[PDB]
Every structure is written in C-alpha cells, then in structure tokens.
C-alpha cells in the first residue's frame, strides 16, 4: 500500500499509508521522501483540497489513489 503523489515536476512520490493515518501523515511521509515542510505542502486529491485532521478512509482514498502536490512558496 502506497499512494502516488505527483509533484510539481511530473515526478511521483510513493509512500506507504493506512486508513488510520491522516492527511498530515501523508505530508510527513512526503517530508521523508522530499524533506518538504508540511507547512508548505498542499496535498490534493481530485481537487477536493484535503484537510489536515482526517484519514484516508474518510476520503475513500485507496493505496494507489494518486494525488498531486502544489507547495506554497511563501515569499522566498
């Protein structure tokens, strides 16, 4: 089990998850795969613009559901 988060360059991060993880855990696994700050991560699924206090089961997200990433740039 491991979703396919497509980053802003067409690359696809792939990391393991469960229906007992949360939308902040997927960002924390991306923080392992890319070292990106969850404070700038903006994970999305079918544009249902995800939260930060849910579970993958709460969105019927599957193990290869695929997602997208559209990080914040803040100012520099």
């Amino acid at each position: 089990m491991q979703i396919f988060v497509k980053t802003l360059t067409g690359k696809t991060i792939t990391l393991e998850v469960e229906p007992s993880d949360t939308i902040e855990n997927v960002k924390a696994k991306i923080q392992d795969k890319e070292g990106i700050p969850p404070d700038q991560q903006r994970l999305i699924f079918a544009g249902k613009q995800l939260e930060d206090g849910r579970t993958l089961s709460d969105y019927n997200i599957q193990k290869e559901s695929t997602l997208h990433l559209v990080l914040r740039l803040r100012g520099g």
């Binding site: 802003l8 903006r42 999305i44 544009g47 613009q49 997208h68 559209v70 914040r72 740039l73």
Partner: protein, 36 residues
C-alpha cells in the same frame, strides 16, 4: 504574460494547471510576490 513568471525551472504550467483556478491562480499571485 511575457513569460515573466518563474518559468521554466521548479514548475511547469502542465503540472500545476492540473487544478481548479482557485489554487493555480494563487500560484499565479504567489509568484508575483515571490519576486516576479
């Protein structure tokens, strides 16, 4: 629109236009404040 935006590195308008405007457009305003 003179491609003055942060292109071509770090992003492509085919890996972020894959969204509703509501977040592409914030990207298009976030780059304006980014220095562009």
């Amino acid at each position: 629109a003179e491609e003055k935006l942060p292109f071509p590195p770090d992003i492509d308008p085919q890996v972020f236009y894959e969204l509703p405007e509501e977040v592409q457009k914030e990207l298009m305003a976030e780059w304006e404040r980014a220095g562009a």
